[PDB]
Amino acid sequence: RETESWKLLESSIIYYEGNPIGTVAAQDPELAALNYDQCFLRDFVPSAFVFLMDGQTDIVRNFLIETLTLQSHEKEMDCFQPGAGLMPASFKVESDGSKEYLVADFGEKAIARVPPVDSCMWWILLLRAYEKATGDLTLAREPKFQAGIKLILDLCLAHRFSMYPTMLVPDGAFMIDRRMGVYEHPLEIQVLFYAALRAARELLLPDGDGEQYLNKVHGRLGALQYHIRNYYWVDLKRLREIYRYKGNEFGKEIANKFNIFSQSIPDWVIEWLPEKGGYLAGNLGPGRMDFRFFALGNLMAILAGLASEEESQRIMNLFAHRWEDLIGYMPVKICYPALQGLEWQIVTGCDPKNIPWSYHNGGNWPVLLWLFTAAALKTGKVELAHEAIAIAEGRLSNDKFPEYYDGNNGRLIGKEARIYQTWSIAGLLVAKQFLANPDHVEFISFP
Amino acid sequence: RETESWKLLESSIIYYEGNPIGTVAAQDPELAALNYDQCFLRDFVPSAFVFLMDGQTDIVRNFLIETLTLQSHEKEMDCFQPGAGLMPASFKVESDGSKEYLVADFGEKAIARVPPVDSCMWWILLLRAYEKATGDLTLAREPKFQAGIKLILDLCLAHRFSMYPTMLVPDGAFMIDRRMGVYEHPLEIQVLFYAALRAARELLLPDGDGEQYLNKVHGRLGALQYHIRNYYWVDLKRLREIYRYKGNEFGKEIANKFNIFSQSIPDWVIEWLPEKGGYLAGNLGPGRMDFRFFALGNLMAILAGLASEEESQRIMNLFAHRWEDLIGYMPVKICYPALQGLEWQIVTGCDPKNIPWSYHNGGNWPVLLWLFTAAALKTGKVELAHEAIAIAEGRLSNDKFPEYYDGNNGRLIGKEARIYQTWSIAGLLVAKQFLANPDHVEFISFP
Amino acid sequence: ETESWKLLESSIIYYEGNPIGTVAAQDPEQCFLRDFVPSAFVFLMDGQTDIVRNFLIETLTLQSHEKEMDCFQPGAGLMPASFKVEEYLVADFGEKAIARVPPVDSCMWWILLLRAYEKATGDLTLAREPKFQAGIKLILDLCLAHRFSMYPTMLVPDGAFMIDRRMGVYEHPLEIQVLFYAALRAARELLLPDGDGEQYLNKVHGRLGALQYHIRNYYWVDLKRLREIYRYKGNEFGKEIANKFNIFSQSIPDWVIEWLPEKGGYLAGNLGPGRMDFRFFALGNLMAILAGLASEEESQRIMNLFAHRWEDLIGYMPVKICYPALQGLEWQIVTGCDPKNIPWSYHNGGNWPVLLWLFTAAALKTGKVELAHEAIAIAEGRLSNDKFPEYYDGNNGRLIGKEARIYQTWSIAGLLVAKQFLANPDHVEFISFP
Numbered sequence A, B: 001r002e003t004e005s006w007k008l009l010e011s012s013i014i015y016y017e018g019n020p021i022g023t024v025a026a027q028d029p030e031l032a033a034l035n036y037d038q039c040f041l042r043d044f045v046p047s048a049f050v051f052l053m054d055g056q057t058d059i060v061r062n063f064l065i066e067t068l069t070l071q072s073h074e075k076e077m078d079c080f081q082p083g084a085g086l087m088p089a090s091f092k093v094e095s096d097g098s099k100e101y102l103v104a105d106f107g108e109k110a111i112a113r114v115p116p117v118d119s120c121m122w123w124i125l126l127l128r129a130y131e132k133a134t135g136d137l138t139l140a141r142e143p144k145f146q147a148g149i150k151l152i153l154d155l156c157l158a159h160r161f162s163m164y165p166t167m168l169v170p171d172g173a174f175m176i177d178r179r180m181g182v183y184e185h186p187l188e189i190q191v192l193f194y195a196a197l198r199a200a201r202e203l204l205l206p207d208g209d210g211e212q213y214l215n216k217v218h219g220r221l222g223a224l225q226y227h228i229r230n231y232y233w234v235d236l237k238r239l240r241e242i243y244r245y246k247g248n249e250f251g252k253e254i255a256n257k258f259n260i261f262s263q264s265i266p267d268w269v270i271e272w273l274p275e276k277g278g279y280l281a282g283n284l285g286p287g288r289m290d291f292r293f294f295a296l297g298n299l300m301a302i303l304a305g306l307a308s309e310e311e312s313q314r315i316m317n318l319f320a321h322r323w324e325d326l327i328g329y330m331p332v333k334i335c336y337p338a339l340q341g342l343e344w345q346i347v348t349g350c351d352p353k354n355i356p357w358s359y360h361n362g363g364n365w366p367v368l369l370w371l372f373t374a375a376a377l378k379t380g381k382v383e384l385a386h387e388a389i390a391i392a393e394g395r396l397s398n399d400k401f402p403e404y405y406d407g408n409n410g411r412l413i414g415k416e417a418r419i420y421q422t423w424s425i426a427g428l429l430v431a432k433q434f435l436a437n438p439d440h441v442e443f444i445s446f447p
Numbered sequence C: 001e002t003e004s005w006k007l008l009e010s011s012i013i014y015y016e017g018n019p020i021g022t023v024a025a026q027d028p029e030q031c032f033l034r035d036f037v038p039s040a041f042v043f044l045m046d047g048q049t050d051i052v053r054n055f056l057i058e059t060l061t062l063q064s065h066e067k068e069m070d071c072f073q074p075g076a077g078l079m080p081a082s083f084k085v086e087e088y089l090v091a092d093f094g095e096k097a098i099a100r101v102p103p104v105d106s107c108m109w110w111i112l113l114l115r116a117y118e119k120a121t122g123d124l125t126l127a128r129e130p131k132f133q134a135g136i137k138l139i140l141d142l143c144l145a146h147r148f149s150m151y152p153t154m155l156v157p158d159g160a161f162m163i164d165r166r167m168g169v170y171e172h173p174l175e176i177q178v179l180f181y182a183a184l185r186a187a188r189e190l191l192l193p194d195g196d197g198e199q200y201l202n203k204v205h206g207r208l209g210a211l212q213y214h215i216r217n218y219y220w221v222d223l224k225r226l227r228e229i230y231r232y233k234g235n236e237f238g239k240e241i242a243n244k245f246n247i248f249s250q251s252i253p254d255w256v257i258e259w260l261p262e263k264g265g266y267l268a269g270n271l272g273p274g275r276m277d278f279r280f281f282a283l284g285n286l287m288a289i290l291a292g293l294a295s296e297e298e299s300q301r302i303m304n305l306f307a308h309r310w311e312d313l314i315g316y317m318p319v320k321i322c323y324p325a326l327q328g329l330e331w332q333i334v335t336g337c338d339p340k341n342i343p344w345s346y347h348n349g350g351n352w353p354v355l356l357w358l359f360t361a362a363a364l365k366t367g368k369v370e371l372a373h374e375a376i377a378i379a380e381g382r383l384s385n386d387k388f389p390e391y392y393d394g395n396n397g398r399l400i401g402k403e404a405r406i407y408q409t410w411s412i413a414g415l416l417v418a419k420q421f422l423a424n425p426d427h428v429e430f431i432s433f434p
């Protein structure tokens, strides 16, 4: 392209041994580098989509290859190894002098040592997206790629103590990589887990032990989908039911299985839901239901076919009804509402980067526009995509594409936002491209 | 024995096909049965110790056998199975009419569907204790028992995403079986996990795939111990260090790895610790340190040899210094301090059974006296055991052996306490028996 | 001449081959005028007087520097909070200082130090020099600037002294009024009775009596006085009224009522329209004793307060800078959510080793030798092991300061001065008045 955004993305590209292998997190000139000079696996996904749609796919291929290689490297902290299948949160290229080499952060350098659980899932989704964009079936089939997928599946499908098909994680294990009360069974992890499973179903070779893998995958998918749809789904009708639940019920055949106390349901959600609206809850576990709306989880649930067609309609209906809360002056609010006061103190451990309506704690994130556009297109609500894109276009180039926006409605540029945040740039590009050729959404959606 | 307590325990015994296989949770006449007419695996352990020391060991043997059989039964909820190794929280004997049969609760009937993670660990510890009390090596070696242990190990040793040797659980996965902010990496789970591993090391046959199991076990133990001792351990010196930590540090070689913000350290702990005192923290995870003192975790850490000899001394030094907080009018407070106010609301989801200084939320639990006596004996602090026992003896028979006591110092009989709680009865019995023959502590301790 | 002596020697700054001051800290990782004071005292008692002389000379030169912020020229008398050697001298006058705080206490410490130098060396010549006499007059011009109000105290913005961050110590904080009083008394001796010098002396006499009266009568807090204020009627209008500053008793905090011992007493932290700050500030109260601003009875009462509330005010590390700490919402509102001054940390109720020298001096003057002994003992038990932290935190000072610099010079000099004061009490006359 000849646009400003195309050129900005082009300079983000990281080269290794004369080859493009990824993109930097940001091209901010004045902020301390911290880990933003690295290539984050989750960040790379919207950049990858841009390159796949342009038709220059070697950077995507090289990324997938190098990341797979990174997985093979021994990862350790104090004589203990995680599962071999773990993908790192990010990597950078280090020049010792002379020859180049790749250094990864698997969680052993990460702040608070958060595990990048979503990384390995995005890896699979990007592998699928590569395949569907290019038609190249050879990459995924190759021995090392097959083995790589299986290692990821081993970690995902690992046996639980719990009675539930969902996946258990520590706090800060996905896009929200800091302590945000998204421990246990956060929506985003479950939705990505579900999507990656469907992808693996397309990607795996039957020959070898794959048959057993595929049967595991098919089994988990059904259970996962049933559980998510029946227990996470929130609308007025279901809320009315939960609110009338009786506490401390014991036995197999009971209504309140997770022992939710109605007195704990927050006041804001009853007023917030429209009659024809609804969404997937943020979390579910013993005695706990997180009613916070999480944007990525809900939008990807539409794209992955996890939410039903009607349920997808009701999520979009919610976006329309509460446009100022979830889009406001910058698509898209990452979650709603913000944690405030003592709740912010207890749940985040007084994390100053996640003060109310900032960053993960109810900030607005430009990148999420690409998921929103795709979901809007999938649900036949093109007009919402136009409006969201229009709003983002009106401020991003002028604000130099900040990492995130703050405030109840995203009025403020993020407190500590990097400028020239690559996936803020890629996010808008992808959204416009989807809008131009809706079919491309099939790279990331499932029938 | 000819004592009142001996007879009370005797009537708790559950018979199945003319054989003793366990004990009821309570013999309370007026409370709704709920799940207290069942045999809880964790509850049975102190009863089992009484019977092992008396020398009537068939009930213990039958319990171990039947529980192992229960493990084999298909456990499911909505087309999803947990790992085969899962032990149930409790079982009861049901008379359809004519023939008897055993029905278990694996979490699918449990309130809030909490998983009984500690159950499978106690199963192994009781198996070891049986063996050491009786000298019978045949039970554990038998094919079905070996397989049973390995299934449990498969679940415990299952591969993580995290960089840590600790074990990840949902909230309410141990003795505290309700939502209490003990999700992620609660001390008790880690200590029991560590103890069960050492037991498995004694129990496993080398022949077969056992060699690989034993090497896994030996590997995990070292990592687990190092991690617990270095990161969970709290005293003035370490607290001074943590408080001076700088937030948001990135990289491998940093002091504040889990990104604890000093401003979040609670005010109470600085005043609470004596100079020569210390303890293992309640939890550790991304951006999170739980400074609450958990009694079972800390005492079992002494018995399991997890805490160092000095560290064990410093824990007991803490008990002595804060005797009124942790023992008060009834040994032993389950954890300190209580969650109060909005913290109680947010963390427990307004759980009315766990109001401040009640039940799990800072209540006093008679059963924990047996662990305290054993730890006191192991640390050469017999006098503390005498005093704790004296206090419990002064009220338990008169109060009809309540399940728990409430209040800052356990003045009140628990709000919803069952009377004739079996492990309240067994707990005192075990403590007196340990006191009479200190060597018996070797049934539950490790060198 | 222990390790502490070596660290202080190593702290010394040189400029063109001459010792001119000491660094704030030798933390493995400049000169603050207030920080230099306890160092100076050690040098004077050890006979190394030239470093103190040079400091007074060099800082005097800094005063005359033309400075401005945004096209505005302030009063000439201003002294910087700190300076650094770069060779040439460069000064921070609050121009580059965080929050643009004005170092009001700097110039008063300058005056008190000039006096101490003279008392220590018996050299009367330095202060008599025209440049020194001019320096003093410039400081007085600013201090004695005419006011709109009937208060003879000195008006300042927040964070204008040792506590140099926003801490609710704006308006008429004790420390400033006490240092103001002491500096005026020092100037009373130091000024030349020249034609010009006479007019300055007139203004000094004209403000000194009024200031002492105001502080003693309206800042003094004890049970008896507290009982009066608690019974004040609100919204009194007139010249002859009891509740002049219109204190509303329902706002008197519950802690002070139970805090005061029967024989205890202290100077309040602040006074102004509708405002009494009941917080205890250690430096203001201890210097009031030394400067002779508090009466003998009042000095004894303050020491009684220390003895009675030893855990609050001394605890693990002498001495708590102020009590009690702003907490919760109050901390939010009054400090503007200042992360360096969280409850029981730093300015907001931390414990500061340097204050030990003031406490020792005050205890010696009041005859409470035992309290000096115990205070010093507590400090000696920790400081070396902890590497002389800048400050300590917590209700009782158990924790080493959150962001404390190690090898903080006035923590080191503070202990030395205290020990040497204890060894020879006559030396307290450097910072005290007959």
Ligand SMILES: OC[C@H]1O[C@@](CO)(O[C@H]2O[C@H](CO)[C@@H](O)[C@H](O)[C@H]2O)[C@@H](O)[C@@H]1O
Pocket (backbone or CB within 6 Å): A025, A034, A035, A036, A040, A042, A043, A109, A110, A111, A112, A114, A174, A175, A176, A177, A178
């Ligand atoms: O160690 C995790 C650490 O990384 C951060 C930023 O340093 O993560 C943010 O930035 C990444 C790069 O764009 C994003 O991938 C991520 O989603 C975002 O949260 C911190 O938040 C976190 O402490």
Ligand SMILES: OC[C@H]1O[C@@](CO)(O[C@H]2O[C@H](CO)[C@@H](O)[C@H](O)[C@H]2O)[C@@H](O)[C@@H]1O
Pocket (backbone or CB within 6 Å): B025, B034, B035, B036, B040, B042, B043, B109, B110, B111, B112, B114, B174, B175, B176, B177, B178
């Ligand atoms: O479904 C779990 C449910 O069981 C309870 C009591 O019904 O657990 C308590 O009682 C058990 C029997 O003594 C103990 O093993 C357990 O430690 C104790 O918490 C409830 O607390 C819980 O909701």
Ligand SMILES: OC[C@H]1O[C@@](CO)(O[C@H]2O[C@H](CO)[C@@H](O)[C@H](O)[C@H]2O)[C@@H](O)[C@@H]1O
Pocket (backbone or CB within 6 Å): C024, C032, C034, C035, C098, C161, C162, C163, C164, C165
């Ligand atoms: O570290 C120096 C830095 O700290 C500040 C902020 O409070 O001042 C503190 O340190 C000074 C030097 O020791 C003290 O004189 C002062 O009392 C203390 O508050 C800044 O002013 C300074 O740049």
